[PDB]
PDB file of all heavy atoms in Angstrom:
ATOM      1  N   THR B  95       4.600  28.946  41.675  1.00  0.00           N
ATOM      2  CA  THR B  95       5.625  28.260  42.290  1.00  0.00           C
ATOM      3  C   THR B  95       7.100  28.581  41.827  1.00  0.00           C
ATOM      4  O   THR B  95       8.011  27.907  42.167  1.00  0.00           O
ATOM      5  CB  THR B  95       5.420  26.719  42.224  1.00  0.00           C
ATOM      6  OG1 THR B  95       5.523  26.279  40.920  1.00  0.00           O
ATOM      7  CG2 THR B  95       4.062  26.433  42.820  1.00  0.00           C
ATOM      8  N   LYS B  96       7.153  29.534  40.954  1.00  0.00           N
ATOM      9  CA  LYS B  96       8.510  29.964  40.423  1.00  0.00           C
ATOM     10  C   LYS B  96       8.669  31.452  40.476  1.00  0.00           C
ATOM     11  O   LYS B  96       7.750  32.202  40.544  1.00  0.00           O
ATOM     12  CB  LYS B  96       8.584  29.458  38.958  1.00  0.00           C
ATOM     13  CG  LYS B  96       8.378  27.956  38.708  1.00  0.00           C
ATOM     14  CD  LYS B  96       8.461  27.620  37.272  1.00  0.00           C
ATOM     15  CE  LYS B  96       8.194  26.091  37.027  1.00  0.00           C
ATOM     16  NZ  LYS B  96       9.178  25.252  37.745  1.00  0.00           N
ATOM     17  N   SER B  97       9.929  31.837  40.326  1.00  0.00           N
ATOM     18  CA  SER B  97      10.337  33.246  40.256  1.00  0.00           C
ATOM     19  C   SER B  97       9.858  33.570  38.807  1.00  0.00           C
ATOM     20  O   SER B  97       9.701  32.668  37.997  1.00  0.00           O
ATOM     21  CB  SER B  97      11.938  33.388  40.288  1.00  0.00           C
ATOM     22  OG  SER B  97      12.526  32.827  39.139  1.00  0.00           O
ATOM     23  N   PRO B  98       9.656  34.864  38.518  1.00  0.00           N
ATOM     24  CA  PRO B  98       9.227  35.244  37.183  1.00  0.00           C
ATOM     25  C   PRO B  98      10.085  34.719  36.007  1.00  0.00           C
ATOM     26  O   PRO B  98       9.524  34.171  35.026  1.00  0.00           O
ATOM     27  CB  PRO B  98       9.289  36.805  37.254  1.00  0.00           C
ATOM     28  CG  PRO B  98       8.873  37.025  38.702  1.00  0.00           C
ATOM     29  CD  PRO B  98       9.690  35.971  39.441  1.00  0.00           C
ATOM     30  N   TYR B  99      11.346  34.764  36.122  1.00  0.00           N
ATOM     31  CA  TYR B  99      12.301  34.344  35.097  1.00  0.00           C
ATOM     32  C   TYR B  99      12.111  32.811  34.834  1.00  0.00           C
ATOM     33  O   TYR B  99      12.136  32.321  33.702  1.00  0.00           O
ATOM     34  CB  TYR B  99      13.746  34.673  35.400  1.00  0.00           C
ATOM     35  CG  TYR B  99      14.691  34.124  34.367  1.00  0.00           C
ATOM     36  CD1 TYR B  99      14.726  34.685  33.071  1.00  0.00           C
ATOM     37  CD2 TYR B  99      15.550  33.079  34.685  1.00  0.00           C
ATOM     38  CE1 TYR B  99      15.587  34.163  32.137  1.00  0.00           C
ATOM     39  CE2 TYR B  99      16.386  32.560  33.653  1.00  0.00           C
ATOM     40  CZ  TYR B  99      16.427  33.223  32.392  1.00  0.00           C
ATOM     41  OH  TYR B  99      17.201  32.671  31.396  1.00  0.00           O
ATOM     42  N   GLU B 100      12.113  32.046  35.899  1.00  0.00           N
ATOM     43  CA  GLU B 100      11.933  30.662  35.695  1.00  0.00           C
ATOM     44  C   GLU B 100      10.660  30.320  35.027  1.00  0.00           C
ATOM     45  O   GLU B 100      10.588  29.409  34.102  1.00  0.00           O
ATOM     46  CB  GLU B 100      12.057  29.785  37.062  1.00  0.00           C
ATOM     47  CG  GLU B 100      12.675  28.496  36.834  1.00  0.00           C
ATOM     48  CD  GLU B 100      12.128  27.454  37.850  1.00  0.00           C
ATOM     49  OE1 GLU B 100      12.046  27.756  39.074  1.00  0.00           O
ATOM     50  OE2 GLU B 100      11.734  26.373  37.413  1.00  0.00           O
ATOM     51  N   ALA B 101       9.620  30.964  35.408  1.00  0.00           N
ATOM     52  CA  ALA B 101       8.269  30.828  34.849  1.00  0.00           C
ATOM     53  C   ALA B 101       8.253  31.084  33.288  1.00  0.00           C
ATOM     54  O   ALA B 101       7.710  30.295  32.599  1.00  0.00           O
ATOM     55  CB  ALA B 101       7.304  31.722  35.592  1.00  0.00           C
ATOM     56  N   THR B 102       8.936  32.176  32.967  1.00  0.00           N
ATOM     57  CA  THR B 102       8.942  32.534  31.547  1.00  0.00           C
ATOM     58  C   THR B 102       9.836  31.553  30.730  1.00  0.00           C
ATOM     59  O   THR B 102       9.631  31.378  29.585  1.00  0.00           O
ATOM     60  CB  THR B 102       9.438  34.022  31.206  1.00  0.00           C
ATOM     61  OG1 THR B 102      10.687  34.243  32.008  1.00  0.00           O
ATOM     62  CG2 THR B 102       8.406  35.011  31.794  1.00  0.00           C
ATOM     63  N   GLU B 103      10.788  30.963  31.433  1.00  0.00           N
ATOM     64  CA  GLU B 103      11.700  29.984  30.783  1.00  0.00           C
ATOM     65  C   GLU B 103      10.816  28.700  30.593  1.00  0.00           C
ATOM     66  O   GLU B 103      10.923  28.065  29.524  1.00  0.00           O
ATOM     67  CB  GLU B 103      12.832  29.636  31.631  1.00  0.00           C
ATOM     68  CG  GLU B 103      13.985  30.654  31.508  1.00  0.00           C
ATOM     69  CD  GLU B 103      14.617  30.599  30.116  1.00  0.00           C
ATOM     70  OE1 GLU B 103      15.391  29.708  29.917  1.00  0.00           O
ATOM     71  OE2 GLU B 103      14.230  31.461  29.254  1.00  0.00           O
ATOM     72  N   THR B 104      10.002  28.334  31.512  1.00  0.00           N
ATOM     73  CA  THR B 104       9.187  27.120  31.432  1.00  0.00           C
ATOM     74  C   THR B 104       8.267  27.288  30.207  1.00  0.00           C
ATOM     75  O   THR B 104       8.238  26.351  29.484  1.00  0.00           O
ATOM     76  CB  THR B 104       8.237  26.962  32.758  1.00  0.00           C
ATOM     77  OG1 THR B 104       9.045  26.855  33.817  1.00  0.00           O
ATOM     78  CG2 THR B 104       7.370  25.753  32.612  1.00  0.00           C
ATOM     79  N   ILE B 105       7.632  28.465  30.127  1.00  0.00           N
ATOM     80  CA  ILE B 105       6.742  28.645  28.889  1.00  0.00           C
ATOM     81  C   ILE B 105       7.521  28.563  27.623  1.00  0.00           C
ATOM     82  O   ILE B 105       7.175  27.812  26.651  1.00  0.00           O
ATOM     83  CB  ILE B 105       6.051  30.020  29.024  1.00  0.00           C
ATOM     84  CG1 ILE B 105       5.163  30.048  30.201  1.00  0.00           C
ATOM     85  CG2 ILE B 105       5.148  30.272  27.708  1.00  0.00           C
ATOM     86  CD1 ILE B 105       4.391  31.334  30.422  1.00  0.00           C
ATOM     87  N   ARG B 106       8.655  29.251  27.573  1.00  0.00           N
ATOM     88  CA  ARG B 106       9.522  29.341  26.384  1.00  0.00           C
ATOM     89  C   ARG B 106       9.830  27.919  25.861  1.00  0.00           C
ATOM     90  O   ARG B 106       9.522  27.556  24.793  1.00  0.00           O
ATOM     91  CB  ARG B 106      10.834  29.997  26.724  1.00  0.00           C
ATOM     92  CG  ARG B 106      11.553  30.693  25.528  1.00  0.00           C
ATOM     93  CD  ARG B 106      13.073  30.901  25.853  1.00  0.00           C
ATOM     94  NE  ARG B 106      13.807  29.723  25.583  1.00  0.00           N
ATOM     95  CZ  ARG B 106      14.743  29.292  26.461  1.00  0.00           C
ATOM     96  NH1 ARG B 106      15.049  29.966  27.516  1.00  0.00           N
ATOM     97  NH2 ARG B 106      15.366  28.155  26.130  1.00  0.00           N
ATOM     98  N   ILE B 107      10.421  27.169  26.761  1.00  0.00           N
ATOM     99  CA  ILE B 107      10.778  25.757  26.408  1.00  0.00           C
ATOM    100  C   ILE B 107       9.448  24.973  25.985  1.00  0.00           C
ATOM    101  O   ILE B 107       9.606  24.385  24.906  1.00  0.00           O
ATOM    102  CB  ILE B 107      11.476  25.074  27.591  1.00  0.00           C
ATOM    103  CG1 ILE B 107      12.892  25.792  27.702  1.00  0.00           C
ATOM    104  CG2 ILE B 107      11.687  23.593  27.272  1.00  0.00           C
ATOM    105  CD1 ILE B 107      13.611  25.476  29.000  1.00  0.00           C
ATOM    106  N   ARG B 108       8.475  24.980  26.805  1.00  0.00           N
ATOM    107  CA  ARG B 108       7.237  24.241  26.408  1.00  0.00           C
ATOM    108  C   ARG B 108       6.563  24.626  25.127  1.00  0.00           C
ATOM    109  O   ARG B 108       6.179  23.793  24.385  1.00  0.00           O
ATOM    110  CB  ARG B 108       6.183  24.331  27.542  1.00  0.00           C
ATOM    111  CG  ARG B 108       4.861  23.640  27.294  1.00  0.00           C
ATOM    112  CD  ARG B 108       5.054  22.211  27.143  1.00  0.00           C
ATOM    113  NE  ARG B 108       3.745  21.480  27.296  1.00  0.00           N
ATOM    114  CZ  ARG B 108       3.590  20.152  27.427  1.00  0.00           C
ATOM    115  NH1 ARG B 108       4.724  19.389  27.361  1.00  0.00           N
ATOM    116  NH2 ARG B 108       2.434  19.631  27.583  1.00  0.00           N
ATOM    117  N   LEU B 109       6.438  25.973  24.862  1.00  0.00           N
ATOM    118  CA  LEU B 109       5.824  26.346  23.621  1.00  0.00           C
ATOM    119  C   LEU B 109       6.814  26.112  22.398  1.00  0.00           C
ATOM    120  O   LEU B 109       6.275  25.960  21.279  1.00  0.00           O
ATOM    121  CB  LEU B 109       5.424  27.794  23.727  1.00  0.00           C
ATOM    122  CG  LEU B 109       4.204  28.093  24.518  1.00  0.00           C
ATOM    123  CD1 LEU B 109       3.742  29.565  24.361  1.00  0.00           C
ATOM    124  CD2 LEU B 109       3.060  27.119  24.168  1.00  0.00           C
TER     125      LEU B 109
END
Side-chain angles (χ1 to χ4, degrees):
Chain B
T95 67
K96 306 177 181 301
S97 68
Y99 179 67
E100 209 210 311
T102 54
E103 277 295 279
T104 300
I105 296 179
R106 204 199 85 224
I107 292 165
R108 177 64 161 188
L109 286 189

